[PDB]
mmCIF file of C-alpha atoms (C1' of nucleotides) in Angstrom:
data_model
loop_
_atom_site.group_PDB
_atom_site.id
_atom_site.type_symbol
_atom_site.label_atom_id
_atom_site.label_comp_id
_atom_site.label_asym_id
_atom_site.label_seq_id
_atom_site.Cartn_x
_atom_site.Cartn_y
_atom_site.Cartn_z
ATOM 1 C CA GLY A 1 -25.558 42.439 98.330
ATOM 2 C CA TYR A 2 -26.464 42.609 102.001
ATOM 3 C CA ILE A 3 -28.629 40.592 104.387
ATOM 4 C CA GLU A 4 -26.962 40.517 107.800
ATOM 5 C CA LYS A 5 -27.153 37.937 110.577
ATOM 6 C CA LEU A 6 -25.279 37.827 113.881
ATOM 7 C CA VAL A 7 -24.182 34.667 115.676
ATOM 8 C CA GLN A 8 -21.720 35.234 118.495
ATOM 9 C CA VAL A 9 -20.620 37.899 120.965
ATOM 10 C CA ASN A 10 -17.895 37.462 123.578
ATOM 11 C CA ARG A 11 -16.025 39.408 126.217
ATOM 12 C CA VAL A 12 -12.325 38.768 125.728
ATOM 13 C CA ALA A 13 -9.865 40.464 128.071
ATOM 14 C CA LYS A 14 -6.211 41.422 128.435
ATOM 15 C CA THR A 15 -4.185 41.822 131.619
ATOM 16 C CA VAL A 16 -1.692 44.663 131.514
ATOM 17 C CA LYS A 17 -0.969 45.945 135.060
ATOM 18 C CA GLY A 18 -3.239 47.702 137.448
ATOM 19 C CA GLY A 19 -6.511 46.430 136.026
ATOM 20 C CA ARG A 20 -7.776 44.264 133.168
ATOM 21 C CA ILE A 21 -8.721 45.711 129.783
ATOM 22 C CA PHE A 22 -11.953 44.373 128.276
ATOM 23 C CA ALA A 23 -12.828 44.066 124.592
ATOM 24 C CA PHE A 24 -15.682 42.625 122.551
ATOM 25 C CA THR A 25 -15.563 40.305 119.559
ATOM 26 C CA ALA A 26 -18.333 39.414 117.153
ATOM 27 C CA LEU A 27 -19.108 36.993 114.347
ATOM 28 C CA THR A 28 -21.510 37.959 111.585
ATOM 29 C CA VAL A 29 -22.356 36.199 108.338
ATOM 30 C CA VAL A 30 -23.729 38.125 105.346
ATOM 31 C CA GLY A 31 -25.486 36.578 102.362
ATOM 32 C CA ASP A 32 -27.641 37.573 99.428
ATOM 33 C CA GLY A 33 -30.504 35.091 99.564
ATOM 34 C CA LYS A 34 -29.387 33.429 96.325
ATOM 35 C CA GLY A 35 -26.100 31.638 96.993
ATOM 36 C CA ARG A 36 -23.510 34.329 97.667
ATOM 37 C CA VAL A 37 -22.428 34.379 101.315
ATOM 38 C CA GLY A 38 -19.587 35.757 103.367
ATOM 39 C CA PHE A 39 -18.694 35.646 107.044
ATOM 40 C CA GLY A 40 -16.818 38.167 109.102
ATOM 41 C CA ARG A 41 -15.114 38.538 112.463
ATOM 42 C CA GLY A 42 -14.395 41.830 114.184
ATOM 43 C CA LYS A 43 -12.950 42.996 117.484
ATOM 44 C CA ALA A 44 -13.608 46.415 118.987
ATOM 45 C CA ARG A 45 -14.276 48.069 122.337
ATOM 46 C CA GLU A 46 -18.094 48.071 122.460
ATOM 47 C CA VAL A 47 -21.105 46.174 121.112
ATOM 48 C CA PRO A 48 -22.510 48.762 118.603
ATOM 49 C CA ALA A 49 -19.038 49.272 117.100
ATOM 50 C CA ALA A 50 -17.833 45.660 117.024
ATOM 51 C CA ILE A 51 -20.847 44.561 115.000
ATOM 52 C CA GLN A 52 -20.252 47.264 112.378
ATOM 53 C CA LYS A 53 -16.637 46.185 111.936
ATOM 54 C CA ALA A 54 -17.575 42.539 111.468
ATOM 55 C CA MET A 55 -20.210 43.434 108.885
ATOM 56 C CA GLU A 56 -17.685 45.233 106.688
ATOM 57 C CA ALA A 57 -15.263 42.316 106.550
ATOM 58 C CA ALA A 58 -18.119 39.972 105.665
ATOM 59 C CA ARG A 59 -18.904 41.676 102.349
ATOM 60 C CA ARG A 60 -15.262 41.359 101.422
ATOM 61 C CA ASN A 61 -13.922 37.892 100.472
ATOM 62 C CA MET A 62 -17.256 36.253 99.684
ATOM 63 C CA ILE A 63 -18.165 32.808 98.292
ATOM 64 C CA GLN A 64 -20.311 31.776 95.319
ATOM 65 C CA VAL A 65 -22.384 28.687 96.200
ATOM 66 C CA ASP A 66 -23.946 26.554 93.458
ATOM 67 C CA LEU A 67 -27.194 25.449 95.055
ATOM 68 C CA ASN A 68 -29.763 23.260 93.285
ATOM 69 C CA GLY A 69 -32.596 25.566 94.365
ATOM 70 C CA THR A 70 -33.484 25.579 98.093
ATOM 71 C CA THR A 71 -31.542 22.281 98.465
ATOM 72 C CA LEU A 72 -28.072 20.843 98.000
ATOM 73 C CA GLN A 73 -26.579 18.713 95.259
ATOM 74 C CA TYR A 74 -25.578 15.576 97.187
ATOM 75 C CA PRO A 75 -24.806 14.386 100.735
ATOM 76 C CA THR A 76 -21.346 15.571 101.745
ATOM 77 C CA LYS A 77 -19.247 15.646 104.897
ATOM 78 C CA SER A 78 -16.524 18.181 105.682
ATOM 79 C CA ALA A 79 -14.339 18.966 108.669
ATOM 80 C CA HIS A 80 -12.092 21.677 110.056
ATOM 81 C CA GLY A 81 -10.305 21.636 113.371
ATOM 82 C CA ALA A 82 -11.894 19.259 115.827
ATOM 83 C CA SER A 83 -15.308 19.827 114.240
ATOM 84 C CA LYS A 84 -17.080 17.486 111.848
ATOM 85 C CA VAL A 85 -20.177 18.462 109.877
ATOM 86 C CA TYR A 86 -22.682 16.372 107.913
ATOM 87 C CA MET A 87 -25.266 17.717 105.447
ATOM 88 C CA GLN A 88 -27.713 16.062 103.081
ATOM 89 C CA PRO A 89 -30.550 17.495 100.967
ATOM 90 C CA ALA A 90 -34.132 16.796 101.954
ATOM 91 C CA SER A 91 -37.743 17.036 100.763
ATOM 92 C CA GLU A 92 -39.773 20.182 100.158
ATOM 93 C CA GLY A 93 -41.879 20.647 103.282
ATOM 94 C CA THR A 94 -39.029 20.145 105.739
ATOM 95 C CA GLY A 95 -37.412 23.453 106.666
ATOM 96 C CA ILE A 96 -33.899 23.925 107.940
ATOM 97 C CA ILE A 97 -33.108 21.873 111.038
ATOM 98 C CA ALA A 98 -29.585 22.569 112.265
ATOM 99 C CA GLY A 99 -27.895 23.915 115.325
ATOM 100 C CA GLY A 100 -27.363 27.550 116.141
ATOM 101 C CA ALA A 101 -24.541 28.489 113.797
ATOM 102 C CA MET A 102 -25.320 26.377 110.758
ATOM 103 C CA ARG A 103 -28.761 27.913 110.562
ATOM 104 C CA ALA A 104 -27.261 31.348 110.070
ATOM 105 C CA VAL A 105 -25.086 30.181 107.199
ATOM 106 C CA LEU A 106 -27.863 28.190 105.582
ATOM 107 C CA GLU A 107 -30.464 30.935 105.862
ATOM 108 C CA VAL A 108 -28.623 33.649 103.976
ATOM 109 C CA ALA A 109 -27.418 31.292 101.269
ATOM 110 C CA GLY A 110 -31.065 30.783 100.326
ATOM 111 C CA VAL A 111 -31.275 27.042 100.899
ATOM 112 C CA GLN A 112 -34.309 25.673 102.700
ATOM 113 C CA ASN A 113 -34.027 21.872 102.932
ATOM 114 C CA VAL A 114 -30.634 21.169 104.415
ATOM 115 C CA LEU A 115 -31.006 18.460 107.178
ATOM 116 C CA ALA A 116 -27.649 18.940 108.884
ATOM 117 C CA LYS A 117 -25.815 17.950 112.075
ATOM 118 C CA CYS A 118 -22.416 18.774 113.568
ATOM 119 C CA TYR A 119 -20.229 16.422 115.582
ATOM 120 C CA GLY A 120 -17.037 16.927 117.525
ATOM 121 C CA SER A 121 -16.404 20.243 119.213
ATOM 122 C CA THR A 122 -19.188 22.772 118.771
ATOM 123 C CA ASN A 123 -17.334 26.036 118.237
ATOM 124 C CA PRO A 124 -19.458 28.713 116.512
ATOM 125 C CA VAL A 125 -16.354 30.475 115.182
ATOM 126 C CA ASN A 126 -15.039 27.178 113.859
ATOM 127 C CA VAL A 127 -18.075 25.262 112.647
ATOM 128 C CA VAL A 128 -18.379 27.983 109.999
ATOM 129 C CA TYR A 129 -15.039 26.974 108.456
ATOM 130 C CA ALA A 130 -16.334 23.409 108.527
ATOM 131 C CA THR A 131 -19.363 24.555 106.563
ATOM 132 C CA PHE A 132 -17.572 26.717 103.989
ATOM 133 C CA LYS A 133 -15.144 24.026 102.990
ATOM 134 C CA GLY A 134 -18.246 22.020 102.161
ATOM 135 C CA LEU A 135 -20.240 24.551 100.180
ATOM 136 C CA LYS A 136 -17.368 26.183 98.290
ATOM 137 C CA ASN A 137 -16.335 22.763 96.922
ATOM 138 C CA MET A 138 -19.634 21.770 95.289
ATOM 139 C CA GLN A 139 -19.798 20.641 91.677
ATOM 140 C CA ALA A 140 -23.269 21.333 90.120
ATOM 141 C CA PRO A 141 -22.959 18.787 87.288
ATOM 142 C CA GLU A 142 -22.528 20.362 83.871
ATOM 143 C CA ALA A 143 -23.396 17.055 82.227
ATOM 144 C CA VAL A 144 -25.750 15.559 79.677
ATOM 145 C CA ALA A 145 -27.396 13.366 82.339
ATOM 146 C CA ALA A 146 -26.723 11.899 85.783
ATOM 147 C CA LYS A 147 -27.215 8.139 85.388
ATOM 148 C CA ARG A 148 -25.523 8.568 82.009
ATOM 149 C CA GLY A 149 -23.573 11.725 82.814
ATOM 150 C CA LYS A 150 -20.050 10.409 83.286
ATOM 151 C CA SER A 151 -18.550 11.177 79.892
ATOM 152 C CA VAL A 152 -18.890 14.978 79.646
ATOM 153 C CA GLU A 153 -18.644 16.025 83.326
ATOM 154 C CA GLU A 154 -15.462 14.108 84.177
ATOM 155 C CA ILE A 155 -13.756 16.020 81.371
ATOM 156 C CA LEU A 156 -15.052 19.059 83.215
ATOM 157 C "C1'" A B 1 -52.811 -1.466 96.247
ATOM 158 C "C1'" A B 2 -45.716 0.401 97.078
ATOM 159 C "C1'" C B 3 -43.568 4.054 99.900
ATOM 160 C "C1'" U B 4 -38.751 9.630 103.342
ATOM 161 C "C1'" G B 5 -35.401 11.781 109.037
ATOM 162 C "C1'" A B 6 -30.872 13.199 111.754
ATOM 163 C "C1'" A B 7 -30.907 20.671 115.831
ATOM 164 C "C1'" G B 8 -28.325 22.219 120.894
ATOM 165 C "C1'" A B 9 -27.109 24.730 125.558
ATOM 166 C "C1'" G B 10 -24.706 25.736 130.566
ATOM 167 C "C1'" U B 11 -20.221 24.745 133.780
ATOM 168 C "C1'" U B 12 -12.495 24.158 134.677
ATOM 169 C "C1'" U B 13 -9.766 30.203 132.836
ATOM 170 C "C1'" G B 14 -6.793 36.860 133.593
ATOM 171 C "C1'" A B 15 -8.930 35.391 128.821
ATOM 172 C "C1'" U B 16 -8.410 31.534 124.433
ATOM 173 C "C1'" C B 17 -8.420 26.549 121.704
ATOM 174 C "C1'" A B 18 -8.826 21.115 123.127
ATOM 175 C "C1'" U B 19 -9.710 16.664 125.888
ATOM 176 C "C1'" G B 20 -13.211 15.121 129.443
ATOM 177 C "C1'" G B 21 -17.099 14.572 133.134
ATOM 178 C "C1'" C B 22 -21.827 16.563 135.035
ATOM 179 C "C1'" U B 23 -26.578 18.965 134.351
ATOM 180 C "C1'" C B 24 -31.203 20.776 131.419
ATOM 181 C "C1'" A B 25 -34.918 21.159 126.864
ATOM 182 C "C1'" G B 26 -38.084 15.512 124.462
ATOM 183 C "C1'" A B 27 -41.441 11.367 124.371
ATOM 184 C "C1'" U B 28 -43.306 7.728 127.651
ATOM 185 C "C1'" U B 29 -45.849 4.747 132.520
ATOM 186 C "C1'" G B 30 -50.750 -1.012 135.651
ATOM 187 C "C1'" A B 31 -47.759 4.944 138.670
ATOM 188 C "C1'" A B 32 -48.041 7.421 143.821
ATOM 189 C "C1'" C B 33 -48.595 12.303 146.096
ATOM 190 C "C1'" G B 34 -50.087 18.044 146.509
ATOM 191 C "C1'" C B 35 -53.725 21.976 144.678
ATOM 192 C "C1'" U B 36 -58.127 22.282 141.924
ATOM 193 C "C1'" G B 37 -62.677 19.925 139.707
ATOM 194 C "C1'" G B 38 -68.905 20.373 134.737
ATOM 195 C "C1'" C B 39 -69.989 16.354 130.886
ATOM 196 C "C1'" G B 40 -69.967 11.970 127.678
ATOM 197 C "C1'" G B 41 -67.900 8.060 124.559
ATOM 198 C "C1'" C B 42 -63.839 3.950 124.522
ATOM 199 C "C1'" A B 43 -60.462 1.715 127.650
ATOM 200 C "C1'" G B 44 -57.963 -0.134 131.984
ATOM 201 C "C1'" G B 45 -57.798 -1.124 137.898
ATOM 202 C "C1'" C B 46 -52.937 -6.030 144.141
ATOM 203 C "C1'" C B 47 -46.536 -4.168 140.385
ATOM 204 C "C1'" U B 48 -46.134 -5.593 147.885
ATOM 205 C "C1'" A B 49 -47.409 -11.126 151.822
ATOM 206 C "C1'" A B 50 -47.276 -17.973 146.250
ATOM 207 C "C1'" C B 51 -49.664 -14.194 153.978
ATOM 208 C "C1'" A B 52 -53.513 -16.218 156.531
ATOM 209 C "C1'" C B 53 -59.416 -16.514 155.517
ATOM 210 C "C1'" A B 54 -65.921 -15.483 158.354
ATOM 211 C "C1'" U B 55 -70.052 -15.890 155.211
ATOM 212 C "C1'" G B 56 -72.692 -16.509 149.742
ATOM 213 C "C1'" C B 57 -72.087 -18.779 144.872
ATOM 214 C "C1'" A B 58 -68.624 -21.038 140.657
ATOM 215 C "C1'" A B 59 -70.368 -28.768 136.927
ATOM 216 C "C1'" G B 60 -73.971 -31.108 136.517
ATOM 217 C "C1'" U B 61 -77.474 -33.666 133.450
ATOM 218 C "C1'" C B 62 -80.438 -37.964 131.241
ATOM 219 C "C1'" G B 63 -87.776 -41.431 133.487
ATOM 220 C "C1'" A B 64 -87.223 -42.379 124.311
ATOM 221 C "C1'" G B 65 -80.901 -47.384 130.472
ATOM 222 C "C1'" C B 66 -83.597 -50.326 134.764
ATOM 223 C "C1'" G B 67 -85.689 -51.016 139.502
ATOM 224 C "C1'" G B 68 -88.657 -49.013 143.295
ATOM 225 C "C1'" A B 69 -92.550 -45.492 145.659
ATOM 226 C "C1'" U B 70 -95.740 -41.091 144.844
ATOM 227 C "C1'" A B 71 -99.846 -42.129 142.882
ATOM 228 C "C1'" A B 72 -103.437 -37.078 139.220
ATOM 229 C "C1'" A B 73 -107.297 -36.573 135.762
ATOM 230 C "C1'" G B 74 -110.604 -39.858 134.735
ATOM 231 C "C1'" G B 75 -113.564 -45.118 134.840
ATOM 232 C "C1'" G B 76 -116.307 -45.647 138.772
ATOM 233 C "C1'" A B 77 -119.322 -48.334 142.307
ATOM 234 C "C1'" G B 78 -121.143 -47.883 147.106
ATOM 235 C "C1'" C B 79 -122.890 -45.045 151.098
ATOM 236 C "C1'" U B 80 -125.427 -39.985 151.955
ATOM 237 C "C1'" U B 81 -121.861 -35.466 150.839
#
RNA sequence: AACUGAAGAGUUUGAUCAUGGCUCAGAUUGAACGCUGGCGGCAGGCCUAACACAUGCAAGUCGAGCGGAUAAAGGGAGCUU
């Protein structure tokens, strides 16, 4: 589906000769409010056209996320580049408390109780990779129990 | 009766990623200063010169321990209040 959310806008450039050609980039994540997200990056020549391009690439190559219901399954920790990310599920009344670019991922996924923090280099185009290695590699235990459930899930 | 939290931003460049400094958003004080100023509860008030101090007051009490001297009421008498 489609619920859109913008994060970043830049002004990249390019020197040719004579002057300097400008261009705009944008980063936009799209989710469904249930656990299907997708991010997208587009470059164009103006703001109202660079956002439209980044929205279209978001709703291609999406991710199914197996959330527990407004929370996560377990504390995990993933990294990409020089960016390290930590996330652990929380109680009911606590909302989402994260920084800038992990709120926009964790809104549209539908989770509400995420309690996150990012270390290392804060790059909004690169902390998103650090988040999607984490969420796309969840497990959601298909087991008979948890304190007992290590005889039917390990064979899954 | 026993008992739960973790946010980032700006700044090196024609522009980008990284390393690395700096700076801001918070909660606090025996606080001082500037502008302004109705009320009441509960608190606190020399952090500097352990530097000198006028004048008041802050440890006395026992006559069921003993001398001594003050000697009432009253008992009076006497003399004339």
